[PDB]
């Protein structure tokens, strides 16, 4: 039971513990979620490259968010910064030492952070350099926002009819969206948690106007809230979720507008891989019903820079690099040599 009296430094961006964790999730992903076709840039010999195709069996099993504890090896120990309000990088005041890390749920999603650690105090936003707009901003929420995304089942048709000269119920065509899904969240809870983001954002950037806009563009994985549950890759449009201007709105009483907001989602087969640069192809959606529920414990944002003034600082949903997903959980951790 030692007590060293020293100024303990801490960081989460230049942390090896995060990059090491990443390697293990990918390994767990390759033995759980396998694509039927994989396309990878065969970059051999500096000169411009070609594509590498590989076809393999793809079982539709579910990738369960099995709790992960990064424990300390013999001869090593991990420090847990127990500061009530930590900024991410810098000197930590109160820090204890546990042997294993808290239960981290391996969730690979963009824009929004689901099933994670909640802040026991207040909302804490952090970035490597807030003055720089290229750096992503990780937001931690203290109030759990439950999101429920689902998709119908086989209840379409229920009976067939045999006939010596014909059959019934087998001509299902109607070129439409059978790979469509939708989510649901509390309008009152989302707007309130959206406000607390602004409250803390203006605490770092005051005399400015915080505006929330959709994704500026890019791969569908970033533009839409992408996640996977049951074996299907969802792509929900987060346009309505992040669409509100804040520069003069601080009250709170009771106002109704649109029962519960619903997100336009779509299940896809061709996916852009997050592990390595490339694409992937999966099997068609499962026949049964897909129901998923999770708590939005945080989110990722990327503000618009530019030396050009307007008085408004726009904040669009970032995300993409899965290193930040585990960084939101391993921010208060640093592996150390037992010396």
């Amino acid at each position: 039971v030692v007590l060293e009296n020293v100024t303990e430094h801490f960081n989460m961006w230049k942390n090896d513990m995060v990059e090491q964790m990443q390697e293990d999730i990918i390994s767990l992903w390759d033995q759980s979620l396998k694509p039927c076709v994989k396309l990878t840039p065969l970059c051999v010999g500096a000169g411009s490259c070609d594509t590498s195709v590989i076809t393999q069996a793809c079982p539709k099993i579910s990738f369960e968010p099995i709790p992960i504890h990064y424990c300390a090896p013999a001869g090593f120990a991990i420090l847990k910064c127990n500061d009530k309000t930590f900024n991410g990088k810098g000197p930590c005041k109160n820090v204890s030492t546990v042997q294993c890390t808290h239960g981290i749920r391996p969730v690979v999603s963009t824009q929004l952070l689901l099933n994670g650690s909640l802040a026991e105090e207040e909302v804490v936003i952090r970035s490597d350099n807030f003055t720089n707009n290229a750096k992503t901003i990780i937001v931690q929420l203290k109030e759990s926002v439950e999101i429920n995304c689902t998709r119908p089942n086989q209840n379409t048709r229920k009976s067939i009819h045999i006939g010596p000269g014909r059959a019934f119920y087998t001509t299902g065509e109607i070129i439409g969206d059978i790979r469509q899904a939708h989510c649901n969240i509390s309008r009152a809870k989302w707007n309130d948690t959206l406000k607390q983001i602004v409250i803390k954002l203006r605490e770092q950037f005051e005399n400015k106007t915080i505006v929330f806009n959709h994704s500026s563009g890019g791969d569908p994985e970033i533009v839409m809230h992408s996640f996977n549950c049951g074996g299907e890759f969802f792509y929900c449009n987060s346009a309505q979720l992040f669409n509100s201007t804040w520069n003069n709105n601080t009250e709170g009483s009771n106002n109704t507008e649109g029962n519960t907001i619903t997100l336009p989602c779509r299940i896809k087969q061709i996916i852009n891989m997050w592990q390595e640069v490339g694409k992937a192809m999966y099997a068609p959606p499962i026949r049964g019903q897909i129901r998923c529920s999770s708590n939005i414990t945080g989110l990722l944002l990327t503000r618009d820079g530019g030396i050009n003034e307007n008085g408004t600082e726009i904040f669009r949903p970032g995300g993409g690099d899965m290193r930040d997903n585990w960084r939101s959980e391993l921010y208060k951790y640093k592996v150390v040599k037992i010396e």
Partner: antibody
Amino acid sequence: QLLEQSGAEVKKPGSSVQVSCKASGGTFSMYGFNWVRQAPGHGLEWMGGIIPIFGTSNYAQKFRGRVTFTADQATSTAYMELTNLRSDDTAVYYCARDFGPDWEDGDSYDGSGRGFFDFWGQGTLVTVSS
Amino acid sequence: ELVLTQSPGTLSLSAGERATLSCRASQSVSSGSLAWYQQKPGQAPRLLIYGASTRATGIPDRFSGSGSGTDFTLTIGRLEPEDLAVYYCQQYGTSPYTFGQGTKLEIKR
């Protein structure tokens, strides 16, 4: 010179005929395999296809309960069987390989492929006579 | 059910000049997906142009396509004695995938 079919033959009315399509060029699994027959002098008529890697198959309404698209990935050969042959079934059946998944814009690949076919087979003429 | 008709039925033109073909549709094609095919005498069909505009690999700059909804046209450039073939148009926006009636392109000499 890479996608070849079987040999032409004659089949008495009422019997079933099976046409193979040996795909020996590159990939067979992910690409869909449709079948479009063509009567002598007439136009092309699409029958249906199959995606080997998924086992999915989409066919035309005109051939209900008559076509059975199967694929053997071991020999990389696509099959097609048509039951209850009649005088109108006499045609040169073509085996066309679907274009494939649209990687840089499309987000799905179901049924029997994208829709159009780039690589085509030699075509086999099945004559229906007694 | 979506049926397609091709005009004209038969076209006999000389070499060097351009040729014009048309594909009329019964309904509006989904997502605007149309395919053109070239079939020489006693041979197998060849993909000419897909997506109504995009050109298939190997196909010369002479062949060009343009169309919208029901009005679809394929324009053959500098004609050649080898270009003699029956042409077909196939839609792939809605099942069943239907082909056109066909246009016999003969060559004048």
